[PDB]
């Protein structure tokens, strides 16, 4: 509705910024370079990859029609991490910390 622009700017200026500032954001900032990381199965398992810079550019470029498409992308980024890796892997514990912060930020999103 009329608050969609309000919610998308919150996702860009608060949610994305605060996740990026988090010490654990580094491995999620750019697409996984599966050649450099020697992960030849990564993009066979992860058919719908997502990363913070892709979300950042989609927000800047007004790619989203509503904030829910953006939330879906964040959700996919976290879910993909838990899918490819094992419970308890370092990257999974990093993602879980970021997801916890993400859900706090969502709980404070304006209802204007």
Swiss-Prot record:
Tissue occurrence: Testis-specific. A 3-fold higher expression is seen in adult testis than in embryo testis. Expression seems to be correlated with histone H4 hyperacetylation during the haploid phase of spermatogenesis (spermiogenesis). No expression, or very low expression is seen in patients' testes with abnormal spermatogenesis. Expressed in cancers such as non-small cell lung cancer and squamous cell carcinomas of the head and neck as well as of esophagus, but not in melanoma or in cancers of the colon, breast, kidney and bladder.
PTM comment text: Ubiquitinated in a SPOP-dependent manner, leading to proteasomal degradation.
Subcellular location: Nucleus
Superkingdom of the source species: Eukaryota
Effect of residue 65 to V: In a gastric adenocarcinoma sample; somatic mutation
All residue ranges annotated as the Bromo domain in the record: 5-109
Site location (Histone H4K5ac binding): 85, 90
Residues that coordinate or bind JQ1: 85
Record remark on domains: Bromo domains mediate interaction with histones that have acetylated lysine residues at specific positions. Bromo domain 1 mediates binding with histone H4 acetylated at 'Lys-5' and 'Lys-8' (H4K5ac and H4K8ac, respectively). The bromo domains also recognize and bind a subset of butyrylated histones: able to bind histone H4 butyrylated at 'Lys-8' (H4K8ac), while it is not able to bind H4 butyrylated at 'Lys-5' (H4K5ac).
Function: Testis-specific chromatin protein that specifically binds histone H4 acetylated at 'Lys-5' and 'Lys-8' (H4K5ac and H4K8ac, respectively) and plays a key role in spermatogenesis. Required in late pachytene spermatocytes: plays a role in meiotic and post-meiotic cells by binding to acetylated histones at the promoter of specific meiotic and post-meiotic genes, facilitating their activation at the appropriate time. In the post-meiotic phase of spermatogenesis, binds to hyperacetylated histones and participates in their general removal from DNA.
Disease: Spermatogenic failure 21: An infertility disorder caused by spermatogenesis defects and characterized by acephalic spermatozoa in the semen of affected individuals. SPGF21 inheritance is autosomal recessive.
Entry similarity comment: Belongs to the BET family.
Subunit structure: Interacts with mRNA splicing machinery proteins SRSF2, DDX5, HNRNPK and TARDBP. Interacts with the acetylated N-terminus of histone H1, H2, H3 and H4. Interacts with P-TEFb components CDK9 and CCNT1/cyclin-T1. Interacts with SMARCE1. Interacts with the acetylated N-terminus of histone H1.4, H2A, H2B, H3 and H4.
General remark: BRDT is a promising target for male contraception. Inhibition by thienodiazepine inhibitor (+)-JQ1 that binds Asn-85, prevents recognition of acetylated histone H4, causing a complete and reversible contraceptive effect in male mice.
Protein name: Bromodomain testis-specific protein
Source species of the chain: Homo sapiens (Human)
Encoding gene (name): BRDT
